[PDB]
DNA sequence: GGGTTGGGGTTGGG
């Protein structure tokens, strides 16, 4: 009953893989992980991936402990520049002779489409890693037990 | 387009393990000023030092306070020295709650979802 | 020591409750869409004015002092808090407003925050202040929430207002999610 | 003012007599009006300058006004398909109506008895000689024979033609100010 | 000289107006962006729409909207899936014809009120609209231009782009006003006469 | 100074037929008018009235009226205005504001109160289409001799039945069972040409805006205003513009019958601070009083004009009847149908 | 928006239709044949259809449906709903915007159902005709509710807790008491 | 601790 839901990489990657492995679901975007989710919560570092040719389009990483993702982020049209959320993390990054860092994102997954990030904020603190871990088995427990 | 499975292990299970591709997280030292980069576990009230030899101490950001190795463990102590970020930490870490997370993670009931099977 | 509950919590207990109740809660999330369409501040005096006689040219007179006063913007703001959990629409008052704006920019001090925000509505200057509200997206804090079960028109109604904002800090909030993660476990 | 309802003789009355009850309507206005004096503010003296300001302000007031009504009539009156030339021939007919009424009631007025009755006198006398030449070229318009007529055309032709209006306008008035 | 018509042209008039820039009907705008092509077939509700419907913009955009080669136009969300996304990009910004009668909350969108506009925009004109024209150009187009669709002989609904009521908007003293009206209508009657009671002619003594 | 001693010792204000123009009068002598117009208006529909009477429902819900009186010619002309709001027994609407719901429903009946049941106009463009309708006829019939005769009702509010009215109310199918209302804003040509092409060129220069609501039903009506929010008449072809608003409300005929029983029985004004109460008829100056009016005669006249339903094919004769508020105006070609309609309108009076 | 539809009215529309179709029903079978009434008693069908009429139509919003069991679920304020629809055909008529979940929709018009089981009679309502006008995302905690899928028990409940529900509970079961009477 | 939308303007019929 709630759009938004935290999980890592590996989560992302067997609900992605069940879902085109047994397509045999209801004729919507939404996937289906003890209900109907568009939203996700993560915690990973991020790094920027060069693409080509593809300049709307930019190609993100997320290596986790789990495993790792892939998501696009969009940039506006009417001109070329870049969210505010994202030069942040370019100028930190020349700032700190280009070490990455771990990040607070939210991002937007729908099937048969890419996975789409819309806001992450820099972490700095090893503590939010444990915080991510109990919230993600926590609210794993009461979807479980709201199920049945 | 690849996957790496890197599971979190506290100071004990090393040598259970004998050596996996695993990442480790721990606070730098440098009272010790080994050639190579040494971290410790805990609340450094009981000594759990472990070197890494691949990355030299000195290389860091000089903010740099906490740091975590995603890396197959060579020997005991020795880790090796693949993926390395930075934390510069205004507050002390805590580490009885990510153990308790650490020990869930192990528990079969939640092993599901942090790996396979 | 505190006691957090969540956003459903506080829910639920909000609809159960009856006309006139009230009850406060503490809970760990994030402001997100600051409320801007209505009218931003109000007037009020300084020997706390319930009567503010408007008048043309700018020109105030206080009935609770009875005196010539310069006029004191108030600021109003609507927003919404949400944890994890779900989302609720919360009222912001002055005190707090001003607190969110000089945390965001110091610059402007506390009390300052108002009057800053009425000579930018007034010159004409929007963009700088919904690039600053914009800026407070996400912002994660710790609320002291309390819900108020009355009725106005004759029409019943939920009212959730904030009434105190302050700093994050990772470590009791994971201490507490462990907790009850354990008691969930043992149970 | 609807034309399924008057005929043109009708129309040309009826705006006689709405503008004759307008004008002393609007009387205590610019009486009220000369009771400042505009050379005292810039706003004003700037565009209209500071020997007879008020004048000037009265005069484009009047004129503007009149434009804006003489077209509106004009626009109610007839239809889109009706020639340019019978518009324009009309809606000469009705300024120089509206200002003949206006100079005749103010002709006799104490404060407009100097510099602004020259002015009005002069605005129409304008519009009788426009009215006058569009009449004369329409005739000349017509003799071309690319235009054909439609029976609403025809019948302002008719009675632009019997009214007479290329020499004078004594033949219409008495049939317009019959009370 | 200029004369006032009983007929008139939403295209014409708006093409009088100096604010606006660039004025057109969707058809001429799709074959000038290359959309579409004249030896392309459409249904003749679906013409009579893209001919009847009028956009208008503040600059010449249609090179920003011109066709991309780099990746072709097929839709797989829902035209609701479009319109939030659309909505969400405006932000903070309160004054556009699709806000109406919602709300955001940070990238979720509600609806809590009737807006009777909604089903223009969700109809199947605009559904085919969409398809035609692609989810990161259509999100774009909401908010850069003016939409107006016919649906009356003469009649237009603004459906999309910022509202046509936000066109239409050191001090110096200003001297207190006589309160004449009070005079009027008094029926009160004092034994005495004079002035009322109350007055601080006579509260002194 | 001036003003306060104006006020005490003077009553000033404006006769029937006199225009805007001001007239002062002595105390006393208003004192002895208040009077003798209380003693008039007694005898024929007001009486003093006691709280106790009319139900505390209505007495905490409903706000009271003022009256004023007129000067006139022999007599005196009341006016009743009903601006105050009650700051107790929280109040924050006078009747206009309360009532206006129900205003909205029947200007909405007015459309087909216009030529379905009887014949009641209400502007200048339904007097000016008739009248050229009839011109037409006049001219196809091939101008014939014309007869016209003129009568007017006295103090039509105050003598409409009650029960009649409220019996018509509930009978009548024109008012559905539920309305909605749609706010919208509505974008216009003024009168102003287009310039043909100093720089500062706006719509407000050639559009003027106008706020509207509008009251529809839930049928599947021809109109179809579900599918587009509003009903505007245009006498052009110039193009006009429409914009939605999200303020929707529902009105139920349940509110319209409880407001109308109300203010039928329980009409309570006020005048030197002595409680008043209307005996007969609908009191003058609500905003739903003219259409109330022109229904209620429209149906006594269709029950009593049946010939001229008939008359133009029975023997082909041209005639016009209209109703303005309480002012008729009949003019037709028979010197017979002529006297036949003031015999039947004297019947039915 | 709540008291939009809190103004429909709903009880007084139920309550009048209910006795319209009490009263049909009545002086339709007025013969009482003893076989008749005995045949005319079996399990499991339908006895009586009585279709609303055009005045009694309302607008709810849709919080959820079930297409195997064909269970529709409406709301409005405090009152919440559970009828039966006559088929996907219905749903298919109202052109919805994007899901039948959350959108505001105008029944055009319904029928009530009156069924023999088990020994007793239960009334059904199934909705005929429906039209989406515009999406209503906002969920309404409805604190009552009465349902029309499981008879008596499923409309006297909660009545103690709203004067509305137990007149019409009170009505429903004057009229059972009525049909059982009549027809046994 | 807040809260329809308060005005501005005044002509011609009823
Ligand atoms: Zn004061």
Same mark, same amino acid.
């Given at each position: 009953?709630?759009?938004?839901?935290?999980?890592?990489?590996?989560?992302?990657?067997?609900?992605?893989?069940? %879902?085109? +492995?047994?397509?045999?679901?209801?004729? $919507? =975007?939404?996937?289906?992980?003890?209900? &109907?989710?568009?939203?996700?919560?993560?915690?990973?570092?991020?790094?920027?991936?060069?693409?080509?040719?593809?300049?709307?389009?930019?190609?993100?990483?997320?290596?986790?402990?789990?495993?790792?993702?892939?998501?696009?982020?969009?940039?506006?049209?009417?001109?070329?520049?870049?969210?505010?959320?994202?030069? %942040?993390? +370019?100028?930190?990054?020349?700032?700190? $002779? =280009?070490?990455?860092?771990?990040?607070? &994102?939210?991002?937007?997954?729908?099937?048969?489409?890419?996975?789409?990030?819309?806001?992450?904020?820099?972490?700095?603190?090893?503590?939010?890693?444990?915080?991510?871990?109990?919230?993600?088995?926590?609210?794993?427990?009461?979807?479980?037990?709201?199920?049945? | 387009?690849?996957?790496?499975?890197?599971?979190?292990?506290?100071?004990?299970?090393?040598?259970?393990?004998?050596?996996?591709?695993?990442?480790?997280?721990?606070?730098?030292?440098?009272?010790?000023?080994?050639?190579?980069?040494?971290?410790?576990?805990?609340?450094?009230?009981?000594?759990?030092?472990?070197?890494?030899?691949?990355?030299?101490?000195?290389?860091?950001?000089?903010?740099?306070?906490?740091?975590?190795?995603?890396?197959?463990?060579?020997?005991?102590?020795?880790?090796?020295?693949?993926?390395?970020?930075?934390?510069?930490?205004?507050?002390?870490?805590?580490?009885?709650?990510?153990?308790?997370?650490?020990?869930?993670?192990?528990?079969?009931?939640?092993?599901?979802?942090?790996?396979?099977? | 020591?505190?006691?957090?509950?969540?956003?459903?919590?506080?829910?639920?207990?909000?609809?159960?409750?009856?006309?006139?109740?009230?009850?406060?809660?503490?809970?760990?999330?994030?402001?997100?869409?600051?409320?801007?369409?209505?009218?931003?501040?109000?007037?009020?005096?300084?020997?706390?004015?319930?009567?503010?006689?408007?008048?043309?040219?700018?020109?105030?007179?206080?009935?609770?002092?009875?005196?010539?006063?310069?006029?004191?913007?108030?600021?109003?703001?609507?927003?919404?808090?949400?944890?994890?959990?779900?989302?609720?629409?919360?009222?912001?008052?002055?005190?707090?407003?001003?607190?969110?704006?000089?945390?965001?920019?110091?610059?402007?001090?506390?009390?300052?925050?108002?009057?800053?925000?009425?000579?930018?509505?007034?010159?004409?200057?929007?963009?700088?202040?919904?690039?600053?509200?914009?800026?407070?997206?996400?912002?994660?804090?710790?609320?002291?929430?309390?819900?108020?079960?009355?009725?106005?028109?004759?029409?019943?109604?939920?009212?959730?207002?904030?009434?105190?904002?302050?700093?994050?800090?990772?470590?009791?909030?994971?201490?507490?999610?462990?907790?009850?993660?354990?008691?969930?476990?043992?149970? | 003012?609807?034309?399924?309802?008057?005929?043109?003789?009708?129309?040309?009355?009826?705006?006689?007599?709405?503008?004759?009850?307008?004008?002393?309507?609007?009387?205590?206005?610019?009486?009220?009006?000369?009771?400042?004096?505009?050379?005292?503010?810039?706003?004003?003296?700037?565009?209209?300058?500071?020997?007879?300001?008020?004048?000037?302000?009265?005069?484009?007031?009047?004129?503007?006004?009149?434009?804006?009504?003489?077209?509106?009539?004009?626009?109610?009156?007839?239809?889109?398909?009706?020639?340019?030339?019978?518009?324009?021939?009309?809606?000469?007919?009705?300024?120089?109506?509206?200002?003949?009424?206006?100079?005749?009631?103010?002709?006799?007025?104490?404060?407009?008895?100097?510099?602004?009755?020259?002015?009005?006198?002069?605005?129409?006398?304008?519009?009788?000689?426009?009215?006058?030449?569009?009449?004369?070229?329409?005739?000349?318009?017509?003799?071309?024979?690319?235009?054909?007529?439609?029976?609403?055309?025809?019948?302002?032709?008719?009675?632009?033609?019997?009214?007479?209006?290329?020499?004078?306008?004594?033949?219409?008035?008495?049939?317009?100010?019959?009370? | 000289?200029?004369?006032?018509?009983?007929?008139?042209?939403?295209?014409?008039?708006?093409?009088?107006?100096?604010?606006?820039?660039?004025?057109?009907?969707?058809?001429?705008?799709?074959?000038?962006?290359?959309?579409?092509?004249?030896?392309?077939?459409?249904?003749?509700?679906?013409?009579?729409?893209?001919?009847?419907?009028?956009?208008?913009?503040?600059?010449?955009?249609?090179?920003?909207?011109?066709?991309?080669?780099?990746?072709?136009?097929?839709?797989?969300?829902?035209?609701?899936?479009?319109?939030?996304?659309?909505?969400?990009?405006?932000?903070?910004?309160?004054?556009?014809?699709?806000?109406?009668?919602?709300?955001?909350?940070?990238?979720?969108?509600?609806?809590?009120?009737?807006?009777?506009?909604?089903?223009?925009?969700?109809?199947?004109?605009?559904?085919?609209?969409?398809?035609?024209?692609?989810?990161?150009?259509?999100?774009?187009?909401?908010?850069?231009?003016?939409?107006?669709?016919?649906?009356?002989?003469?009649?237009?609904?603004?459906?999309?782009?910022?509202?046509?009521?936000?066109?239409?908007?050191?001090?110096?003293?200003?001297?207190?006003?006589?309160?004449?009206?009070?005079?009027?209508?008094?029926?009160?009657?004092?034994?005495?006469?004079?002035?009322?009671?109350?007055?601080?002619?006579?509260?002194?003594? | 100074?001036?003003?306060?001693?104006?006020?005490?010792?003077?009553?000033?204000?404006?006769?029937?037929?006199?225009?805007?123009?001001?007239?002062?009068?002595?105390?006393?002598?208003?004192?002895?008018?208040?009077?003798?117009?209380?003693?008039?208006?007694?005898?024929?529909?007001?009486?003093?009235?006691?709280?106790?009477?009319?139900?505390?429902?209505?007495?905490?819900?409903?706000?009271?009226?003022?009256?004023?009186?007129?000067?006139?010619?022999?007599?005196?002309?009341?006016?009743?205005?009903?601006?105050?709001?009650?700051?107790?027994?929280?109040?924050?609407?006078?009747?206009?504001?309360?009532?206006?719901?129900?205003?909205?429903?029947?200007?909405?009946?007015?459309?087909?109160?216009?030529?379905?049941?009887?014949?009641?106009?209400?502007?200048?463009?339904?007097?000016?289409?008739?009248?050229?309708?009839?011109?037409?006829?006049?001219?196809?019939?091939?101008?014939?001799?014309?007869?016209?005769?003129?009568?007017?009702?006295?103090?039509?509010?105050?003598?409409?039945?009650?029960?009649?009215?409220?019996?018509?109310?509930?009978?009548?199918?024109?008012?559905?069972?539920?309305?909605?209302?749609?706010?919208?804003?509505?974008?216009?040509?003024?009168?102003?040409?287009?310039?043909?092409?100093?720089?500062?060129?706006?719509?407000?220069?050639?559009?003027?805006?106008?706020?509207?609501?509008?009251?529809?039903?839930?049928?599947?009506?021809?109109?179809?205003?579900?599918?587009?929010?509003?009903?505007?008449?245009?006498?052009?072809?110039?193009?006009?513009?429409?914009?939605?608003?999200?303020?929707?409300?529902?009105?139920?005929?349940?509110?319209?019958?409880?407001?109308?029983?109300?203010?039928?029985?329980?009409?309570?004004?006020?005048?030197?601070?002595?409680?008043?109460?209307?005996?007969?008829?609908?009191?003058?100056?609500?905003?739903?009083?003219?259409?109330?009016?022109?229904?209620?005669?429209?149906?006594?006249?269709?029950?009593?004009?049946?010939?001229?339903?008939?008359?133009?094919?029975?023997?082909?004769?041209?005639?016009?009847?209209?109703?303005?508020?309480?002012?008729?105006?009949?003019?037709?070609?028979?010197?017979?149908?002529?006297?036949?309609?003031?015999?039947?309108?004297?019947?039915?009076? | 928006?709540?008291?939009?539809?809190?103004?429909?009215?709903?009880?007084?529309?139920?309550?009048?239709?209910?006795?319209?179709?009490?009263?049909?029903?009545?002086?339709?079978?007025?013969?009482?044949?003893?076989?008749?009434?005995?045949?005319?008693?079996?399990?499991?069908?339908?006895?009586?259809?009585?279709?609303?009429?055009?005045?009694?139509?309302?607008?709810?919003?849709?919080?959820?449906?079930?297409?195997?069991?064909?269970?529709?679920?409406?709301?409005?304020?405090?009152?919440?709903?559970?009828?039966?629809?006559?088929?996907?055909?219905?749903?298919?008529?109202?052109?919805?915007?994007?899901?039948?979940?959350?959108?505001?929709?105008?029944?055009?018009?319904?029928?009530?159902?009156?069924?023999?089981?088990?020994?007793?009679?239960?009334?059904?309502?199934?909705?005929?005709?429906?039209?989406?006008?515009?999406?209503?995302?906002?969920?309404?905690?409805?604190?009552?509710?009465?349902?029309?899928?499981?008879?008596?028990?499923?409309?006297?409940?909660?009545?103690?807790?709203?004067?509305?529900?137990?007149?019409?509970?009170?009505?429903?079961?004057?009229?059972?008491?009525?049909?059982?009477?009549?027809?046994?």
């Amino acid at each position: 009953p709630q759009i938004t839901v935290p999980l890592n990489c590996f989560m992302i990657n067997q609900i992605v893989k069940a %879902a085109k +492995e047994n397509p045999q679901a209801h004729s $919507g =975007n939404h996937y289906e992980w003890y209900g &109907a989710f568009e939203n996700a919560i993560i915690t990973a570092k991020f790094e920027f991936l060069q693409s080509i040719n593809d300049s709307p389009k930019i190609m993100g990483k997320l290596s986790d402990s789990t495993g790792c993702i892939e998501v696009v982020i969009q940039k506006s049209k009417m001109s070329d520049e870049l969210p505010e959320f994202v030069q %942040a993390y +370019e100028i930190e990054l020349q700032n700190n $002779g =280009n070490r990455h860092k771990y990040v607070r &994102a939210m991002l937007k997954m729908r099937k048969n489409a890419q996975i789409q990030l819309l806001y992450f904020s820099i972490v700095n603190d090893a503590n939010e890693i444990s915080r991510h871990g109990l919230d993600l088995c926590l609210r794993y427990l009461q979807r479980k037990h709201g199920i049945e | 387009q690849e996957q790496v499975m890197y599971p979190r292990i506290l100071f004990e299970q090393m040598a259970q393990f004998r050596g996996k591709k695993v990442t480790v997280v721990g606070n730098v030292c440098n009272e010790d000023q080994n050639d190579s980069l040494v971290i410790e576990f805990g609340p450094t009230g009981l000594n759990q030092h472990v070197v890494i030899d691949n990355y030299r101490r000195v290389d860091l950001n000089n903010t740099t306070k906490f740091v975590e190795i995603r890396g197959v463990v060579l020997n005991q102590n020795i880790v090796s020295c693949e993926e390395l970020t930075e934390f510069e930490q205004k507050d002390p870490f805590d580490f009885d709650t990510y153990s308790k997370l650490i020990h869930l993670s192990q528990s079969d009931k939640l092993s599901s979802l942090f790996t396979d099977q | 020591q505190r006691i957090y509950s969540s956003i459903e919590e506080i829910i639920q207990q909000a609809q159960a409750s009856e006309i006139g109740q009230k009850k406060e809660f503490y809970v760990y999330g994030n402001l997100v869409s600051i409320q801007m369409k209505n009218k931003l501040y109000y007037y009020r005096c300084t020997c706390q004015g319930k009567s503010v006689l408007k008048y043309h040219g700018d020109s105030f007179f206080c009935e609770s002092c009875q005196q010539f006063i310069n006029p004191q913007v108030h600021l109003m703001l609507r927003a919404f808090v949400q944890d994890s959990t779900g989302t609720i629409p919360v009222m912001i008052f002055d005190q707090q407003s001003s607190q969110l704006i000089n945390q965001i920019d110091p610059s402007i001090h506390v009390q300052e925050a108002g009057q800053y925000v009425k000579n930018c509505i007034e010159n004409g200057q929007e963009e700088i202040i919904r690039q600053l509200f914009s800026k407070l997206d996400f912002a994660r804090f710790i609320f002291e929430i309390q819900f108020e079960n009355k009725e106005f028109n004759n029409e019943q109604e939920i009212a959730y207002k904030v009434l105190k904002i302050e700093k994050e800090n990772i470590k009791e909030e994971s201490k507490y999610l462990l907790k009850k993660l354990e008691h969930l476990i043992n149970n | 003012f609807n034309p399924n309802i008057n005929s043109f003789e009708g129309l040309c009355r009826q705006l006689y007599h709405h503008s004759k009850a307008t004008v002393m309507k609007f009387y205590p206005f610019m009486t009220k009006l000369f009771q400042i004096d505009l050379k005292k503010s810039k706003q004003y003296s700037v565009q209209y300058g500071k020997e007879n300001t008020n004048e000037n302000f009265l005069k484009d007031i009047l004129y503007y006004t009149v434009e804006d009504v003489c077209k509106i009539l004009c626009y109610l009156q007839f239809e889109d398909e009706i020639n340019s030339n019978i518009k324009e021939i009309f809606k000469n007919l009705y300024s120089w109506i509206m200002w003949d009424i206006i100079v005749s009631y103010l002709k006799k007025k104490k404060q407009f008895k100097g510099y602004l009755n020259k002015l009005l006198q002069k605005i129409r006398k304008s519009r009788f000689f426009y009215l006058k030449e569009g009449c004369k070229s329409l005739q000349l318009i017509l003799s071309q024979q690319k235009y054909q007529l439609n029976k609403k055309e025809l019948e302002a032709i008719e009675f632009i033609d019997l009214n007479n209006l290329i020499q004078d306008i004594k033949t219409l008035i008495p049939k317009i100010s019959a009370k | 000289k200029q004369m006032l018509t009983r007929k008139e042209d939403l295209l014409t008039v708006l093409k009088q107006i100096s604010a606006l820039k660039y004025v057109s009907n969707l058809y001429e705008f799709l074959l000038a962006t290359e959309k579409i092509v004249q030896t392309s077939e459409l249904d003749t509700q679906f013409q009579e729409f893209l001919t009847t419907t009028i956009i208008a913009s503040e600059q010449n955009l249609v090179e920003n909207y011109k066709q991309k080669y780099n990746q072709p136009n097929f839709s797989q969300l829902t035209i609701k899936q479009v319109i939030d996304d659309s909505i969400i990009l405006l932000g903070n910004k309160q004054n556009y014809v699709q806000q109406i009668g919602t709300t955001t909350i940070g990238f979720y969108v509600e609806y809590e009120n009737i807006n009777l506009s909604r089903q223009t925009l969700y109809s199947s004109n605009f559904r085919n609209l969409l398809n035609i024209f692609g989810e990161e150009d259509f999100k774009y187009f909401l908010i850069d231009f003016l939409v107006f669709t016919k649906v009356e002989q003469n009649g237009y609904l603004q459906v999309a782009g910022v509202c046509l009521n936000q066109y239409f908007s050191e001090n110096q003293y200003i001297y207190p006003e006589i309160q004449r009206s009070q005079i009027f209508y008094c029926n009160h009657m004092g034994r005495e006469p004079g002035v009322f009671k109350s007055s601080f002619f006579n509260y002194s003594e | 100074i001036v003003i306060p001693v104006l006020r005490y010792n003077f009553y000033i204000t404006e006769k029937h037929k006199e225009g805007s123009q001001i007239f002062y009068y002595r105390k006393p002598i208003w004192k002895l008018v208040s009077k003798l117009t209380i003693v008039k208006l007694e005898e024929e529909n007001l009486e003093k009235v006691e709280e106790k009477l009319i139900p505390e429902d209505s007495f905490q819900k409903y706000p009271q009226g003022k009256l004023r009186i007129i000067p006139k010619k022999g007599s005196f002309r009341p006016i009743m205005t009903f601006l105050r709001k009650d700051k107790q027994k929280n109040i924050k609407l006078n009747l206009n504001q309360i009532l206006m719901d129900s205003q909205l429903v029947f200007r909405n009946l007015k459309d087909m109160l216009g030529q379905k049941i009887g014949y009641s106009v209400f502007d200048n463009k339904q007097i000016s289409e008739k009248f050229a309708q009839f011109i037409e006829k006049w001219k196809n019939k091939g101008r014939p001799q014309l007869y016209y005769v003129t009568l007017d009702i006295k103090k039509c509010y105050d003598s409409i039945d009650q029960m009649k009215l409220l019996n018509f109310f509930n009978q009548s199918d024109l008012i559905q069972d539920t309305y909605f209302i749609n706010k919208y804003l509505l974008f216009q040509r003024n009168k102003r040409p287009l310039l043909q092409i100093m720089d500062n060129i706006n719509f407000p220069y050639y559009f003027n805006l106008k706020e509207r609501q509008i009251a529809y039903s839930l049928y599947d009506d021809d109109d179809q205003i579900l599918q587009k929010g509003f009903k505007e008449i245009q006498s052009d072809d110039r193009p006009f513009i429409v914009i939605n608003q999200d303020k929707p409300r529902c009105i139920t005929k349940d509110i319209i019958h409880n407001h109308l029983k109300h203010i039928s029985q329980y009409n309570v004004i006020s005048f030197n601070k002595v409680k008043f109460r209307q005996k007969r008829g609908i009191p003058q100056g609500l905003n739903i009083s003219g259409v109330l009016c022109s229904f209620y005669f429209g149906k006594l006249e269709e029950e009593y004009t049946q010939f001229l339903k008939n008359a133009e094919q029975v023997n082909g004769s041209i005639n016009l009847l209209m109703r303005l508020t309480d002012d008729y105006l009949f003019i037709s070609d028979s010197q017979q149908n002529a006297l036949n309609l003031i015999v039947q309108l004297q019947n039915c009076a | 928006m709540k008291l939009l539809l809190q103004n429909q009215n709903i009880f007084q529309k139920l309550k009048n239709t209910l006795n319209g179709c009490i009263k049909k029903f009545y002086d339709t079978y007025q013969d009482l044949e003893q076989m008749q009434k005995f045949e005319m008693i079996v399990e499991d069908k339908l006895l009586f259809r009585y279709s609303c009429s055009q005045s009694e139509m309302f607008s709810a919003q849709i919080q959820a449906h079930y297409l195997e069991k064909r269970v529709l679920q409406l709301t409005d304020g405090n009152v919440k709903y559970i009828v039966n629809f006559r088929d996907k055909g219905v749903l298919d008529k109202a052109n919805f915007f994007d899901t039948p979940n959350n959108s505001l929709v105008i029944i055009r018009q319904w029928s009530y159902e009156i069924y023999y089981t088990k020994n007793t009679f239960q009334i059904n309502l199934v909705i005929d005709e429906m039209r989406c006008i515009d999406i209503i995302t906002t969920i309404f905690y409805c604190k009552l509710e009465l349902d029309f899928t499981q008879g008596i028990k499923g409309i006297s409940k909660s009545s103690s807790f709203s004067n509305q529900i137990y007149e019409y509970s009170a009505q429903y079961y004057k009229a059972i008491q009525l049909l059982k009477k009549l027809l046994i």
